[PDB]
Amino acid sequence: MQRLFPLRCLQISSFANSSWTRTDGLAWLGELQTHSWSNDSDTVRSLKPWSQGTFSDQQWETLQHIFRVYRSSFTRDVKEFAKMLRLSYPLELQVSAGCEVHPGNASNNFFHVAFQGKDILSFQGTSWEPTQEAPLWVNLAIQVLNQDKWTRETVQWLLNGTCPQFVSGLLESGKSELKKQVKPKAWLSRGPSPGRLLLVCHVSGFYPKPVWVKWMREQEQQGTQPGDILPNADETWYLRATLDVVAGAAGLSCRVKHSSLEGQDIVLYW
């Protein structure tokens, strides 16, 4: 299950114009949000008793300082780049960064940067590198970024050293909460919807996220449309696996496969 728990450090930076800007951030260990970073705060809030991992209060405060410095400079850099290139506002930047630990103490890391919802560049090994699609103005932006030796060192330090060590401690600290199973409640219903009905198979209050819900004719799958797995404020999930059918077909079942049921499935007939 180690692969199902990567650390994703997410940054959203909105620049409406030359004056207005805000940068907010989150941390996800697998499907669990472990941290939050508001623009109105000097520090990075921990949302779980185990969110610090195995890091000491002073080890955590060094990271707080790195992040605060990173934030203010990141805004500075973008405002400067948009001025040098004449990239007119409003600008939105996003960062997906972190790592994933593998067995035998090996890891995999990443640093992806998007501009207006499109990938533009990534950190690769020791330096920034542009995406394959990436416009020509990005190659100039990277040239200036790759000149900064200190930054390339810190991001190598965070991605290669801090991150693998962080998540190993998060996995040991949060072991209990990460292993929880919450069984779903399932029911069928008349989903409102020419000459067609919507069959709705409700699956709710399940944990963790992986679920397989499918409409069946027993031993015969259909053109099942399980929609988004929607979130609940208690970290459980909700799913409406729906089937668009012609009037009658009234000999179809719903098969619900989830980890909390321990190998057995919930079958609902109608």
């Epitope: 000491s56 002073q58 060094t62 707080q64 790195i66 330090w157 801090t162 991150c163």
Partner: nanobody, 126 residues
Framework: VQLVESGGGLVQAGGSLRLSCAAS????????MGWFRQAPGKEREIVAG????????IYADSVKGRFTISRDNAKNTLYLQMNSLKPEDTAVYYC????????????????????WGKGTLVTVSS
């Protein structure tokens, strides 16, 4: 961000000298501090490095058991207590700082420290 070293001078062999370093910035306690030295001809090497309270500091084999590094987070100052000095210890002593994240060991090379003072001059005779 800004560091100033003080305590350099002339010391006789077997002597003792206490260098000090003043930091200008905020959250001094989260910065890694280091004492580096450069003798005429020879490259700029490390003498002592220090980071978190729980963490043991690092030393160069030549200055192990003779020199001691310490910090006074409140006084925002870094110290180097040089004891049983040799003429070999004649060098320009620099004060260095850097933000080093938790998963990484205190750096031994000068290329890894970002803030450098203008340095102090220490000379040992006999």
């Amino acid at each position: 961000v800004q560091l100033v070293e003080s305590g350099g001078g002339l010391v006789q062999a077997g002597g003792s000298l206490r260098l000090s370093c003043a930091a200008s910035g905020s959250s001094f306690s989260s910065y890694t501090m280091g004492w580096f030295r450069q003798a005429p001809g020879k490259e700029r090497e490390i003498v002592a490095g220090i980071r978190w309270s729980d963490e043991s500091p690092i030393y160069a084999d030549s200055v192990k058991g003779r020199f001691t590094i310490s910090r006074d987070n409140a006084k925002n100052t870094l110290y180097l207590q040089m004891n049983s000095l040799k003429p070999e210890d004649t060098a320009v002593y620099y004060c260095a700082a850097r933000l080093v994240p938790p998963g990484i060991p205190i750096p031994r090379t000068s290329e890894s420290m970002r803030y450098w003072g203008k340095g102090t001059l220490v000379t040992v005779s006999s």
